[PDB]
């Protein structure tokens, strides 16, 4: 039976109604929320002595011992040589003199001891020359404190506090440790600073044995009218490992700054920050971190401010990137970008929208082109609809102006040359029609229904030669099944590909007798009537194919029960002669505690060659694409162990990508977690193979002092390929 119930079996309930009138009962002793029982009582007028097997109980504590005393006007009390047990809360212990003062607020213990462990289960205890439990500040204060595990003291101090509730308090948190191949032994000691209800900090020294020095990790969190955010500043004054690999340099400091903010204010002002900066490219490969990862090739630096109302929005933003690889030192930034949208429905039968952008492009390299771009995009559409189908028609103008600067260096290297002033105007036309057929299922079960949903879309965009515009912001988009119906081949405004194509596709859905969707499957293709061109069509493919049915995609989802889910998708491109990418996953999930997921990811070698930097087709670490099998599981053993684990495997290499294993044992009195991870953490250029990092991490916690109560869902996201719930 569940752990909260096992722990509650050791915790007194309250047997009486919550609440003055007074009652005394005796042979010629039981007295009455607060109750006193004894063999003998002597009363004076107001005070009592009590003697023999003295027992006292109350809305928050049981007390027991040889002798009692009280003042009945103030409810001040003394029990000598006693023991105590909290009511509706887990704590208990002993004292040579136990005292109630300040009308039940303060419970004092001379030569006291305290634990959250249930009776006889004596794992750990505090001992002190004095203890005070204060019910209003939710705190135990201890003088000459010794902390014992079993009978032996682990620690001493002249003074100590435990928080014994859920109200926040400043001071040290319980430390943690790990052993890593990267830093050897590591230790973390958080101090928590409770600044205000709406803001706090944590200061955490992080010792690393290999480096011989402490990194100082500083976290600050805030909540404000403008939103909520977090700042992290991690700083290491010098690094004896770095100072051997980079020995000529001026200083071996390492640092990370992170800031994240999001908020919407007065329903109209939108604020966002997503900012990371680090001292060097190697930072996330050396230092395990909450925000970056060894999986990341750059740090993102973004700010935005927006005004939004129901029919209009305007956003100003910057977008800067710090790129870690030495392989290209160029990086474009938007400094700033302004976006504007305006909406107007029912303009006669038509709905209208205008998109406007102004952006300045800056590069880290002194010799790269710079530009300003201005874009304006009026759109008019005519939506028509029925019970059984619809058709949408749109027209747009794609008007753009560039001013380009710093061209002398680039025009020295290339035969196609950039132009200082470029206008591009393009009309776009789109027609997009849908139907919905229904059918009663005689075969699967009573009351089930199948839907069949054909779509077709025509798109025309004319050719403009764009080879005099440098590509600052246009990546090639991935053509998934919903992606068959995009009006864009590229992600920005620097490449707009000509279009003359019909996309066709079909979805089918199965609905049960409660009208819940149980299953769907989608298939579609793009048929191109003319070659889709930009004039900078320097992409490389297996085939010279240009027209016809070039792109296929499909997608399915089966909700097999409220516990089982199957997802998968495939992209096939005839210009690769091959499946471009695929993924699938099956999941079973009964609880947060109980899940198994299998997943597969494929991306072909031809897809890498067609869509990623040209050296990826030569570098053995990128060249082969992706063929990755993954298994993720969480299960409880008894009601007290959680076992969590992930394994990810490269099926071309026959080598592990990632492996994680987490075990948490969870008592009523404490919990312990061990976590292991082994990950791909770089490449050895001199030997031409992958590098692995191992980490073993030890976390320990007290329980019964707070509402905090099997560790599963945190472990499942600790690794480089973290769990996403696919039901």
């Amino acid at each position: 039976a569940d752990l909260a119930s096992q722990c509650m079996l050791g915790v007194p309930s309250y047997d009486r109604p919550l609440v003055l009138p007074v009652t005394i009962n005796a042979d010629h002793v039981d007295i009455m929320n607060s109750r006193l029982q004894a063999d003998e009582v002597q009363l004076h007028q107001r005070t009592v002595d009590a003697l023999g097997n003295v027992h006292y109980d109350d809305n928050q504590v049981i007390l027991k011992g040889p002798k009692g005393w009280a003042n009945l006007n103030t409810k001040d009390t003394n029990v000598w040589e006693g023991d105590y047990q909290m009511v509706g809360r887990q704590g208990r212990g002993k004292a040579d003199l136990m005292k109630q003062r300040g009308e039940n607020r303060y419970t004092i213990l001379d030569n006291g001891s305290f634990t959250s462990c249930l009776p006889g289960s004596d794992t750990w205890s505090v001992v002190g020359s004095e203890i005070i439990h204060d019910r209003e500040e939710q705190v135990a204060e201890i003088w000459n404190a010794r902390f014992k595990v079993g009978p032996v003291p682990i620690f001493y101090s002249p003074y100590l506090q435990l928080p014994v509730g859920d109200k926040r308090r400043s001071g040290f948190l319980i430390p943690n440790a790990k052993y890593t191949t990267t830093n050897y032994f590591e230790f973390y000691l958080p101090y928590y600073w409770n600044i205000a209800p709406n803001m706090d900090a944590t200061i955490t020294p992080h010792y690393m044995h290999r480096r011989g020095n402490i990194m100082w990790e500083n976290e600050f969190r805030y909540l404000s009218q403008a939103g909520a955010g977090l700042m992290e500043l991690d700083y290491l004054p010098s690094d004896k490992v770095y100072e051997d690999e980079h020995p000529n340099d001026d200083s071996s400091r390492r640092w990370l700054f992170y800031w994240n903010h999001s908020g919407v204010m007065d329903q109209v002002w939108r604020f966002n920050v997503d900012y990371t900066k680090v001292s060097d490219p190697s930072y996330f490969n050396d230092f395990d971190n909450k925000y970056g990862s060894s999986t990341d090739g750059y740090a993102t630096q973004k700010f935005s401010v927006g005004y939004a109302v129901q029919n209009f929005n305007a956003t100003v933003s910057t977008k800067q990137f710090q790129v870690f690889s030495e392989q290209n030192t160029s990086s474009y930034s938007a400094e700033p970008q302004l976006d504007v949208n305006y909406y107007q429905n029912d303009v006669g039968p038509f709905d209208t929208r205008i998109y406007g952008q102004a952006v300045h492009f800056v590069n880290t390299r002194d010799d790269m082109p710079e530009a300003t771009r201005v874009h304006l995009e009026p759109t008019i559409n005519l939506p028509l609809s029925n019970n059984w189908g619809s058709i949408n028609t749109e027209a747009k103008l794609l008007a753009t102006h560039y001013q380009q600067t710093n061209l002398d260096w680039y025009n020295s290297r290339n035969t196609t040359k950039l132009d200082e002033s470029v206008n591009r105007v393009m009309p776009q036309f789109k027609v997009d029609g849908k139907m919905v057929f229904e059918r009663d299922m005689e075969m699967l079960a009573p009351g089930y229904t199948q839907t069949l949903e054909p779509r077709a879309q025509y798109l025309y965009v004319p050719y403009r030669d764009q080879s005099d515009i440098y590509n600052y912001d246009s990546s090639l988009l991935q053509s998934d099944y919903s992606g068959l119906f995009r009006d864009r081949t590229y992600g920005g405004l620097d490449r707009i590909a000509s279009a003359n194509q019909v996309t066709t596709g079909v979805t089918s859905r199965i609905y049960d007798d409660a009208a819940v969707e149980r299953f769907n499957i989608s298939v579609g293709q793009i048929y191109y009537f003319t070659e889709s061109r930009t004039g900078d069509d320097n992409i490389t493919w297996e085939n010279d194919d240009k027209t016809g049915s070039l792109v296929w995609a499909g997608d399915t989802y089966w909700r097999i029960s409220e516990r089982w889910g199957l997802r998968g998708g495939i992209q096939y491109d005839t210009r690769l002669d091959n499946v471009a990418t695929s993924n699938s996953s099956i999941e079973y999930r009964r609880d947060e505690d109980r899940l198994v997921q299998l997943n597969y990811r494929y991306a072909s070698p031809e897809y890498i060659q067609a869509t990623l930097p040209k050296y990826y087709s030569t570098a053995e670490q990128y060249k082969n694409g992706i063929s990755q099998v993954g298994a993720v599981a969480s299960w409880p053993i008894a009601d007290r162990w959680s076992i969590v684990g992930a394994y990810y495997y490269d099926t071309n290499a026959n080598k592990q990508a990632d492996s994680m294993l987490g075990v948490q044992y969870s008592s009523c009195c404490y919990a312990i977690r061990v976590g292991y991870e082994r990950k791909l953490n770089g490449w050895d250029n001199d030997k031409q193979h992958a590098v692995y990092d191992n980490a073993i991490g030890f976390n320990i916690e007290l329980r019964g002092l707070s509402s905090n109560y099997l560790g599963t869902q945190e472990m499942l996201r600790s690794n480089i390929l973290p769990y996403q719930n696919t039901l």
Partner: peptide, 11 residues
């Protein structure tokens, strides 16, 4: 010893 929790507006 100290104890962390969710942020909230005063009061």
């Amino acid at each position: 010893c100290g104890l962390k929790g969710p942020l909230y507006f005063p009061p």
